[PDB]
Amino acid sequence: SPQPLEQIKLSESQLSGRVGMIEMDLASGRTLTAWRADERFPMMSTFKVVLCGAVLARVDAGDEQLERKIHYRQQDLVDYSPVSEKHLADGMTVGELCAAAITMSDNSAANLLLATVGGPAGLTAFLRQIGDNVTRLDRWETELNEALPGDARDTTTPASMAATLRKLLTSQRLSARSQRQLLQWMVDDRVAGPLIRSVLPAGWFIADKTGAGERGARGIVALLGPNNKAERIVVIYLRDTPASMAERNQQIAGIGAALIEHWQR
Ligand SMILES: OC[C@H]1O[C@H](O[C@H]2[C@H](O)[C@@H](O)[C@H](OCCCCCCC3CCCCC3)O[C@@H]2CO)[C@H](O)[C@@H](O)[C@@H]1O
Ligand SMILES: *C(=O)/C(=C/N[C@@H](C(=O)O)C(C)(C)S(=O)O)CO
């Protein structure tokens, strides 16, 4: 593999799209690799990790319980609700909804949670409260995936997303138990976690959330490291590429391969 930066460049040339990337030490926030780190990219389903950080903040403050059962209706459901469509009669707890949103990318679960935190405006206010002045949510599922060229709605930057994830997971803004819960939901991702593990060398830790949108938009927010440790945050977004899903996946995997091959930096 090329050095990570050279692989990122190759991925842009091959995709004919924009890649944005950060590699950050989880414990310290040291930025190791940065490429278009201050440019905007649609979050797509990666926003669901920040969403559940806001939920956990409410739990910590005594304004929410993960146990609280939310009753909902069929008319509430949006496209792609593999878990929530199964519980129209009996409802789902707030914690189950976060598990469905993060681990299954259940869109109706995400909207139900968004309703508990004040909608897109409320989630954006939470981001501002934790010192992220860049990331913004404007719309609900599934419109937030539209990825119109040049449109700032529903975007983050690799640098802001990585800093925000670090804040949520490690900064004691969230309680110890809440930090552990957010981490566990990422460890439990069913959409990409097992596939990623199938191609990682033995000994490498993965936790993640992935996203996809229009016009080739694709992303992953992840924790990765050797010796079975979540050593680094890696955030990679792609946008404005005509490439197949398979090739977008392969290019992201190639960046990961370069990071692994050149880990000591
Ligand atoms: O010397 C380092 C390693 O080199 C290879 O590992 C390969 C592996 O066989 C391949 O499957 C992977 O592809 C990359 C898979 C990455 C999966 C997605 C990663 C995510 C994680 C972070 C967010 C962005 C991408 O590359 C590594 C590095 O060459 C050898 O197989 C392995 O025995 C050896 O320990
Ligand atoms: C998370 O990124 C999600 C993406 N969904 C899209 C996809 O390509 O899978 C759509 C088809 C645009 S849709 O939102 O289902 C789930 O919100």
Side-chain angles (χ1 to χ4, degrees), residues 24-29 162-171 233:
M24 177 181 285
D25 186 280
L26 176 62
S28 73
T164 285
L165 289 171
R166 183 167 171 274
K167 286 172 182 177
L168 292 171
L169 291 166
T170 73
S171 76
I233 292 164

Side-chain angles (χ1 to χ4, degrees), residues 40-44 47-48 50-51 110-111 114-115 117-128 132-148 150-157 161 239:
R40 275 187 296 243
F41 295 82
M43 288 181 281
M44 313 150 294
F47 96 94
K48 290 168 187 177
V50 175
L51 170 63
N111 280 349
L114 270 170
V117 303
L123 186 58
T124 302
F126 172 73
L127 283 155
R128 299 295 171 269
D132 181 338
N133 292 318
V134 175
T135 304
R136 52 184 286 180
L137 198 74
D138 296 86
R139 289 174 293 179
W140 300 74
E141 290 292 358
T142 61
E143 289 79 19
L144 68 83
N145 304 296
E146 194 179 20
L148 292 169
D151 185 358
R153 287 180 296 175
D154 310 303
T155 59
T156 190
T157 67
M161 180 57 72
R239 66 179 304 160

Side-chain angles (χ1 to χ4, degrees), residues 17-37:
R18 280 178 197 261
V19 174
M21 182 272 192
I22 282 281
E23 177 192 24
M24 177 181 285
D25 186 280
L26 176 62
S28 73
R30 188 202 166 204
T31 299
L32 285 88
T33 312
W35 171 262
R36 304 192 187 281

Side-chain angles (χ1 to χ4, degrees), residues 10-200:
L10 188 56
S11 294
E12 286 209 348
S13 169
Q14 292 179 177
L15 291 167
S16 294
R18 280 178 197 261
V19 174
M21 182 272 192
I22 282 281
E23 177 192 24
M24 177 181 285
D25 186 280
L26 176 62
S28 73
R30 188 202 166 204
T31 299
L32 285 88
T33 312
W35 171 262
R36 304 192 187 281
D38 299 314
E39 302 188 25
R40 275 187 296 243
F41 295 82
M43 288 181 281
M44 313 150 294
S45 299
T46 73
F47 96 94
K48 290 168 187 177
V49 177
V50 175
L51 170 63
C52 287
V55 172
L56 291 165
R58 292 169 30 81
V59 173
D60 285 350
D63 293 315
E64 185 56 280
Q65 302 147 320
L66 292 188
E67 289 87 350
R68 181 172 71 102
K69 184 100 74 54
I70 307 295
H71 179 246
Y72 55 92
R73 293 171 180 82
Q74 193 161 353
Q75 66 206 121
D76 296 322
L77 305 177
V78 297
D79 184 29
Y80 201 68
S81 297
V83 184
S84 55
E85 80 184 15
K86 290 180 171 178
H87 297 104
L88 285 173
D90 29 54
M92 295 176 62
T93 68
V94 170
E96 281 183 319
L97 290 163
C98 273
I102 292 170
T103 79
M104 290 291 280
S105 226
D106 189 296
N107 286 324
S108 297
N111 280 349
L112 291 164
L113 296 162
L114 270 170
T116 71
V117 303
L123 186 58
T124 302
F126 172 73
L127 283 155
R128 299 295 171 269
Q129 285 185 26
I130 65 170
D132 181 338
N133 292 318
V134 175
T135 304
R136 52 184 286 180
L137 198 74
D138 296 86
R139 289 174 293 179
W140 300 74
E141 290 292 358
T142 61
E143 289 79 19
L144 68 83
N145 304 296
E146 194 179 20
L148 292 169
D151 185 358
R153 287 180 296 175
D154 310 303
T155 59
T156 190
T157 67
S160 294
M161 180 57 72
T164 285
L165 289 171
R166 183 167 171 274
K167 286 172 182 177
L168 292 171
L169 291 166
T170 73
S171 76
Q172 334 268 249
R173 282 173 179 85
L174 294 183
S175 72
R177 193 178 184 239
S178 287
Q179 287 182 161
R180 287 200 293 277
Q181 175 68 96
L182 189 57
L183 173 59
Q184 189 62 45
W185 284 325
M186 294 183 70
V187 165
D188 283 337
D189 177 37
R190 297 280 138 40
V191 173
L195 175 62
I196 292 163
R197 286 188 191 92
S198 82
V199 291
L200 278 178

